[PDB]
Amino acid sequence: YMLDLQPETGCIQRTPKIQVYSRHPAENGKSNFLNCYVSGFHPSDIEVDLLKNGERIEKVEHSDLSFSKDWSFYLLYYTEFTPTEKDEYACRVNHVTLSQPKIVKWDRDGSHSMRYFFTSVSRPGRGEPRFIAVGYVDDTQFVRFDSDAASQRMEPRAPWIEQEGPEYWDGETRKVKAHSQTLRVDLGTLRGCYNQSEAGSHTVQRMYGCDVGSDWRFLRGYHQYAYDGKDYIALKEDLRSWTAADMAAQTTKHKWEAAHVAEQLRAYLEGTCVEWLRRYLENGKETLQRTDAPKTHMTHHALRCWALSFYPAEITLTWQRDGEDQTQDTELVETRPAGDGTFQKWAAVEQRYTCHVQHEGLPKPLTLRW
Amino acid sequence: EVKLVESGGGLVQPGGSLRLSCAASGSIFSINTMGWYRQTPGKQRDLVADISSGGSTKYGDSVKGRFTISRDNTKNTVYLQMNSLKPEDTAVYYCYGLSYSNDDYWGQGTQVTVS
């Protein structure tokens, strides 16, 4: 359930981290999914190909554009495939930060939250800005909107949200369309305030949501903006005052203080956001309230600790040499989606070392040794 | 191991045409997809056109309809027919190839300038 208020504003490039992997462990003749997970990049424009034997795979899908707390984007490109002995797979990524496309080969051998993410990217001459909105309950996407898609409707991405009737979808479609129209205005407004040319492409990002404890009672709320991956204005934890990053955001801050925008946001974050998060947790209890403990194992190099098929994504993998936390000389890979609702992770640093796994689905933390 | 020999660039008038050519050395079983990227004004190089050994093609949006890639798959040589050239097509066009193990090879590039 989105916010029914779109206040207008008044008034650094990051290269993608790439991971290529399969959904399940590879077994010849067994149908699987080949994933390429790009993350931590800015701006959002990116070209991702899945390669099979030095050739592009035709039918490749990808997740809806979302971003992290630091405003950097992440995407999951995937396709169904049956691996065999001869076939070799890789992922090729092109981005403004790269002098040439990077290829990465596939090595065959509690609390709850609701979040809404909004991205609008200007395309001068090419048409109206590309607007993408996604909604999350914890680490599960359940709604989306894409301005270039055919439906021009808010679409379901989880089974438990398909229950909702036409009044729900009409309202969310109305609100998300007004979201995009406001960000379109914000793009043209921010271009002039920063004295930028009309030909360049720019990005505005909006994020808001609410956290609840295990008692489903309000904990914290968020409502922040970014321009070109840089903090612009954010609502503080008290939900009453604003943090402005630079002089352009000070004008927006004063306009929003005079219009009492924070009062309307606090009512949403403390009340409406919590109310519908509780409804979603109930309607999708089979999916949202499950815990899946990580299937763990270890491998030795000629030491890598693995964790697979766990939910939620929150996990901790630490290395200990004789009990002391060995932070240095430790390669920790970012948690990645398997594509079926579960997640994966591994860390790398013989009998003196141990791997510690902490996860909500585990009765007690696990220790792994060679 | 693999060497890519490029030719066919140079100066051309607006509306004119050029035919780039790229021949791969070594075994025929050493290269699958062959094609071209071109240097953007900044750091990046953008996809122009490439073709698999089976003849599967892909074009960048800014050259669709005007550029045509073809392949004489006896010699692992690909040809890029660049029609209706504009000043915005001016760049260094890098030939590239993919091995059947997804190793990428890159040529030195050929400057293309449209008056």
Q: What SS3 class is residue B62?
A: helix
Check CB contact of B87 with chain A, cutoff 8 Å. Answer: no
Domain region containing B78: 4-114
Contacts of A95 in chain B (CB under 8 A): 44
- How far is the C-alpha of A72 from the C-alpha of A224, rounded, in Å? 14
- How far is the C-alpha of A243 from the C-alpha of A225, rounded, in Å? 10
| Beta carbons of A186 and A8 less than 8 angstroms apart | yes
Instruction: Write the Ramachandran bin of B67: left for phi over 0, alpha for psi from -120 to 50, otherwise beta.
Output: beta
Q: Closest approach of chain A CAs to the CA of B115, in angstroms?
A: 23
Contacts of A6 (CB under 8 A, 6+ apart): A178, A179, A181, A182
- How far is the C-alpha of B73 from the C-alpha of B67, rounded, in Å? 19
Contacts of B47 in chain A (CB under 8 A): 47, 94
CB atoms inside a 10 Å sphere around CB A159: 12
* CA distances, A120 to each of A43, A85, A303 (Å): 11, 43, 43
Q: Which residues of B3-41 are buried (b: 16+ CB within 10 A; e: fewer)?
A: ebebebbeebeeeeebebbbbbeeeeebbbbbbbbbbee
Q: Closest approach of chain B CAs to the CA of A88, in angstroms?
A: 6
For chain A, the residue count is 370
The encoded tokens of residue A15 equal 């290269």
C-alpha triplet A229, A231, A237: angle, nearest 5°: 135
| Beta carbons of A272 and A2 less than 8 angstroms apart | no
* CA distances, A296 to each of A76, A101, A327, A358 (Å): 23, 34, 21, 11
- How far is the C-alpha of B64 from the C-alpha of B48, rounded, in Å? 9
Q: How many domains does chain B have?
A: 1
Whether residues A94 and B56 touch (CB distance < 8 A) is answered with no
Whether residues B101 and A89 touch (CB distance < 8 A) is answered with no
**DSSP characters over B74-85:** TTTEEEEEE-S-
- How far is the C-alpha of B112 from the C-alpha of B115, rounded, in Å? 10
The encoded tokens of residue A137 equal 């309950």
Contacts of B16 (CB under 8 A, 6+ apart): B85, B114
CB atoms inside a 10 Å sphere around CB A156: 18
How many CB pairs lie under 8 A apart between chains A and B? 63
Q: Which helix (H) or strand (E) holds B64?
A: none
Q: Which residues pair with A56 in a beta bridge?
A: A51
Q: Which residues pair with A210 in a beta bridge?
A: A114, A221
Looking at residue B26, the DSSP 8-state letter turns out to be S
Rg of the Cα trace of chain A? 22
Contacts of B35 in chain A (CB under 8 A): none
Residues 18-57 of A with CB under 8 A from B: 47, 51, 53-56
- How far is the C-alpha of A275 from the C-alpha of B115, rounded, in Å? 64
Looking at residue B41, the DSSP 8-state letter turns out to be S
Q: Which residues pair with A37 in a beta bridge?
A: A19, A76
- How far is the C-alpha of A145 from the C-alpha of A153, rounded, in Å? 7
Query: If you search the block for the tokens 């904990």, which residue do you land on?
Result: A219
Q: Closest approach of chain A CAs to the CA of B13, in angstroms?
A: 25
Q: Which residues pair with A144 in a beta bridge?
A: A134, A155
The bridge status of strand B110-114 relative to strand A353-358 is unpaired
- How far is the C-alpha of A341 from the C-alpha of A324, rounded, in Å? 34
* CA distances, A113 to each of A116, A214, A269, A340 (Å): 10, 11, 11, 20
Closest to A71 measured CA to CA, from A223, A229, A203, A208: A229
Contacts of A203 (CB under 8 A, 6+ apart): A42, A43, A44, A119, A120, A121, A122, A226, A227, A228, A229
The distance of Cα B19 from the centroid of its chain, to the nearest Å, equals 10
SS3 string of chain A?
A: CCCCCCCCCCCCCECCEEEEEECCCCCCCCCEEEEEEEEEEECCCCEEEEEECCCECCCCEECCCEECCCCCEEEEEEEEECCCCCCCEEEEEECCCCCCCEEEECCCCCCEEEEEEEEEEEECCCEEEEEEEEEEECCEEEEEEECCCCCCCCEECCHHHCCCCHHHHHHHHHHHHHHHHHHHHHHHHHHHHCCCCCCCCCEEEEEEEEEECCCCCEEEEEEEEEECCEEEEEECCCCCCEEECCHHHHHHHHHHHHCCHHHHHHHHHHHHHHHHHHHHHHHCHHHHCCCECCEEEEECCCCEEEEEEEECCCCEEEEEECCEECCCCCEECCCEECCCCCEEEEEECCCCEEEEEECCCCCCCEEEEC
| Beta carbons of B70 and B84 less than 8 angstroms apart | no
Closest to A14 measured CA to CA, from A99, A120, A95: A95
Burial label for B103, CB within 10 Å (0-12, 13-18, 19+), is middle
Contacts of B42 in chain A (CB under 8 A): 96
Q: Closest approach of chain B CAs to the CA of A70, in angstroms?
A: 24
Q: What SS3 class is residue B89?
A: helix
Assess whether the previous peptide bond of A43 is cis (omega < 30° from 0). Answer: yes
The bridge status of strand B10-12 relative to strand B110-114 is parallel
CATH code (residue B85): 2.60.40.10
Q: Closest approach of chain B CAs to the CA of A41, in angstroms?
A: 15
Q: Which residues pair with A179 in a beta bridge?
A: none
Q: Which helix (H) or strand (E) holds B45?
A: strand B45-51
| Beta carbons of A246 and A240 less than 8 angstroms apart | no
Sequence letter at residue A308: L
Q: Which residues of A231-254 are buried (b: 16+ CB within 10 A; e: fewer)?
A: bbbbbeeebeebebbeebbeebbe
Closest to A154 measured CA to CA, from A178, A187, A129: A178
Half-sphere exposure of B54 (CA within 13 A, CB side): 9
| Beta carbons of A132 and A116 less than 8 angstroms apart | no
Rg of the Cα trace of chain B? 13
The C-alpha torsion from A143 through A148 and A150 to A151, rounded to 10°, is 30
Whether residues B33 and A55 touch (CB distance < 8 A) is answered with yes
| Beta carbons of B52 and B33 less than 8 angstroms apart | yes
Whether residues B102 and A101 touch (CB distance < 8 A) is answered with no
Helix A166-193 / helix A247-258 crossing angle, nearest 10 deg: 140
| Sign of the torsion formed by the C-alpha atoms of A224, A228, A230 and A233 | negative
| Beta carbons of A220 and A210 less than 8 angstroms apart | yes
| Beta carbons of A368 and A320 less than 8 angstroms apart | no
Half-sphere exposure of A45 (CA within 13 A, CB side): 16
- How far is the C-alpha of A306 from the C-alpha of A100, rounded, in Å? 31
Closest chain A residue by Cα to residue B58: A56
* CA distances, A22 to each of A80, A85, A309 (Å): 10, 15, 12
Burial label for B49, CB within 10 Å (0-12, 13-18, 19+), is buried
The bridge status of strand B104-106 relative to strand B45-51 is unpaired
Sequence letter at residue A84: T
- How far is the C-alpha of A190 from the C-alpha of A227, rounded, in Å? 8
Assess whether the previous peptide bond of A166 is cis (omega < 30° from 0). Answer: no
Q: Which residues of A183-208 are buried (b: 16+ CB within 10 A; e: fewer)?
A: bbebbebbbebeeeeeeebbbbbbbb
Closest to B31 measured CA to CA, from B66, B67, B9, B1: B1
| Beta carbons of B36 and B80 less than 8 angstroms apart | yes
